[PDB]
Amino acid sequence: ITIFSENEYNEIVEMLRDYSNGDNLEFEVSFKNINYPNFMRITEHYINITPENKIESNNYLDISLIFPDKNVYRVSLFNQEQIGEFITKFSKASSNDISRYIVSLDPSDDIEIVYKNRGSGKLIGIDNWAITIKSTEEIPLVAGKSKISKPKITGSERIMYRYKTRYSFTINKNSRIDITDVKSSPIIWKLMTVPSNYELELELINKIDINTLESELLNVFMIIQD
C-alpha cells in the first residue's frame, strides 16, 4: 500500500531537501476531515502509547495580524491569566489599538511570535488520500536576539483569533503528531463558545527519508480509518 504517486513522491523528496537546507522552513502533513469522534480516537491512542515526557498539552490564544500582501504576524499567548486579561481589555477596543498592542509585545516563553511568509511555501494535495503536504516559512522572533524592523501597522490589517487546545506527541527524534481542538473567529466576542473544529498534523523536527514519512502516514491512517 503506497500513498504517493511517482510524481508526488519526487516532488515531496525535493520539498524535504528544501526543508532540510532552509533556515525557517517547516514541513507539515495536514490530515483532513477530522471531526470530534476522530479527535477523541487519535488523542486517546497517542496518550496511551506515548511516554509522559514526550507529551505536551497546552491551551493558548493565537492572534494573527493579516496584511494586504497575505503574510501574517502571529502572537501565541500561553499564559491563561494573560489570555483573560487580553480578552477583557480588548473586547470592545479598536482593531488598530489591538494591532499596535500585538506588534508591541516582546517574545518570552509564554508569548511566541512568528512572521509567516505565506507566499514562499509549496502546498500539494495528494491523489485519493485526504492529506496535504505543506512547506512554509515561519520566522520566529525570539528574546535576546537582535530586533529586526517589525511590520508597519497601516490600519488596514485583518485580525483572526484562534483559541486552541493542543496535544503534541513527540513520536521520535524527527517527528511530532499535533492534534488540536480549535475555536476560530474574526472577532473576540464569545470566542470560547464558538463550535470547535479539529486539526491533525504530522510535523517534522528534522528531515527524514520519504519512505519513513510514508510509513508514518500509513500508521496515522490506520488509526483514523474505520
UniProtKB/Swiss-Prot annotation:
Family in the record: In the N-terminal section; belongs to the dsDNA virus mRNA guanylyltransferase family. In the C-terminal section; belongs to the class I-like SAM-binding methyltransferase superfamily. mRNA cap 0 methyltransferase family.
Taxonomic source organism: Acanthamoeba polyphaga mimivirus
Biological role: Responsible for methylating the 5'-cap structure of mRNAs.
Transmembrane regions: none
Covered range of the whole protein: 12 to 237 of 1170
Cell location: Virion
Protein name per the record: Probable mRNA-capping enzyme
Domain of life of the native organism: Viruses
